[PDB]
Amino acid sequence: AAPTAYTPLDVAQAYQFPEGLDGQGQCIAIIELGGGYDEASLAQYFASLGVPAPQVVSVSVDGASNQPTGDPSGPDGEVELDIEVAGALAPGAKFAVYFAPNTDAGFLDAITTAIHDPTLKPSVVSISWGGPEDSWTSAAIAAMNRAFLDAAALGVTVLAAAGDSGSTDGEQDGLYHVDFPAASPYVLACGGTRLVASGGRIAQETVWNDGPDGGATGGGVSRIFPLPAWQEHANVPPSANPGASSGRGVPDLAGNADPATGYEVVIDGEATVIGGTSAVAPLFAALVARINQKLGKAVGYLNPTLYQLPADVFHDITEGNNDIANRAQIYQAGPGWDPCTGLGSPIGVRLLQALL
Numbered sequence: 001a002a003p004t005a006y007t008p009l010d011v012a013q014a015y016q017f018p019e020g021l022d023g024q025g026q027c028i029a030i031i032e033l034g035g036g037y038d039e040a041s042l043a044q045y046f047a048s049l050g051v052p053a054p055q056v057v058s059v060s061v062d063g064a065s066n067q068p069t070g071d072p073s074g075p076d077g078e079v080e081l082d083i084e085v086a087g088a089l090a091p092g093a094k095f096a097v098y099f100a101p102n103t104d105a106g107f108l109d110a111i112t113t114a115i116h117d118p119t120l121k122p123s124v125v126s127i128s129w130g131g132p133e134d135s136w137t138s139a140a141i142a143a144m145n146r147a148f149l150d151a152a153a154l155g156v157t158v159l160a161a162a163g164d165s166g167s168t169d170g171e172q173d174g175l176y177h178v179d180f181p182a183a184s185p186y187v188l189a190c191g192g193t194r195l196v197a198s199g200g201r202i203a204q205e206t207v208w209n210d211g212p213d214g215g216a217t218g219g220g221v222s223r224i225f226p227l228p229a230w231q232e233h234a235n236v237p238p239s240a241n242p243g244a245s246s247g248r249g250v251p252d253l254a255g256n257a258d259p260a261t262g263y264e265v266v267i268d269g270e271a272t273v274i275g276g277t278s279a280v281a282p283l284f285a286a287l288v289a290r291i292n293q294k295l296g297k298a299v300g301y302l303n304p305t306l307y308q309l310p311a312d313v314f315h316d317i318t319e320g321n322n323d324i325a326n327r328a329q330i331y332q333a334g335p336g337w338d339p340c341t342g343l344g345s346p347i348g349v350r351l352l353q354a355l356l
């Protein structure tokens, strides 16, 4: 009954993305730690979709490059998903794709390279790579967080997928875990929903959770970052971990991620349907580029503002949980901000209006 797949244009129509804006005059940076894209996959994608193929440029960081491995189950499914979702929705934007070694060094460098790129000058950075907070060294965490801090002062929005393994984030240690870089207070963390869209509008939108075998959105309470003052009115709960400690609530926003209501894309030259919170940072990156186009000034660091905007700028997700480690429903969605979906799915035209 409910659709089993969407085009990005369908998802954007449900989230009322602001029309007649295509990201012209903006650059979206996408960070990549493996695989690549091929011109054949993208051209087929955008032709079948029916949108003018956007300009995409590969950038080599620390010696890595654009190199498809041909396995749609590998990193190409990430690189091509990121370009196809964001390019479908901001096809007037220029896309800058930074390829780096999958190392602490390569991840950081790819980000700092993007933020400061004097030639492509992206106003938005989209990230769909990560790892549980404690899987990172404290120094790597610090370098990265300072890059995000830098991004904010430069007027560059940084978005990042919150993770595809629920509230335990792929760690079995009796503890709940959030993913980094989504946990950074300077990053717009992107969570995952199952969307059911009907007639261009949302018929239902619930937490993405297909069990331990099909994935769940990341979400929870940071153990590294304290609760930011802009989250003081969001009713963030304490971590569900034994000392009940206060912390940055993840994520900030959420959108369609459930493979079961997935995106129709072309990976390694073949059609398929995939999801993952990996699709949602591109999705909203496109949204931000459209807003930048209309306001004529980069929104830059957006998190604090979101939380003080009127609640009706967001579609509230209230049903579901992102627990795949057990049946205790940690964490669960509910009225207002929750640790599965944040403030909810943005309603693009209202968000823009509130920023005018």
Ligand SMILES: [Ca+2]
Pocket (backbone or CB within 6 Å): 316, 317, 318, 333, 334, 335, 336, 337, 338, 341, 342, 343, 344
């Ligand atoms: Ca909610």
